[PDB]
């Protein structure tokens, strides 16, 4: 029925969040890296031509 109030008289443990000294987070990774499908396609065309269509 009654409630214990010492934990209220103090900082009741394990309630919401407790912090230490966490550091060095580093945020996140990256969304891949600049992709070059366009240039790869174009250079493939260039080599194909320079080999077979450039006798």
């Amino acid at each position: 029925m009654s409630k214990i109030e010492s934990a209220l008289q103090a900082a009741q443990p394990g309630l919401s969040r407790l912090r230490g000294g966490a550091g060095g987070m580093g945020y996140r990774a990256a969304t891949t890296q600049a992709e070059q499908p366009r240039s790869s396609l174009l250079d493939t065309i260039g080599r194909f031509a320079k080999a077979g269509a450039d006798m």
Partner: protein
Amino acid sequence: AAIGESMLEGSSMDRIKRVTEGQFIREANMVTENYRRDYQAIFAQQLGGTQSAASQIDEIYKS
């Protein structure tokens, strides 16, 4: 330390620390976001360079 020796406790005394902890969280969120903008700029520059190289290779091939 100060809110611990005050002898008041309550909701307002926790709102003091909650607001402070929030300021640090938002400030870190800005460091984490300024980085995202810089990475996006690098991404755009890399795509621009790749497209320029592609166009130059087309020009060379066209002779």
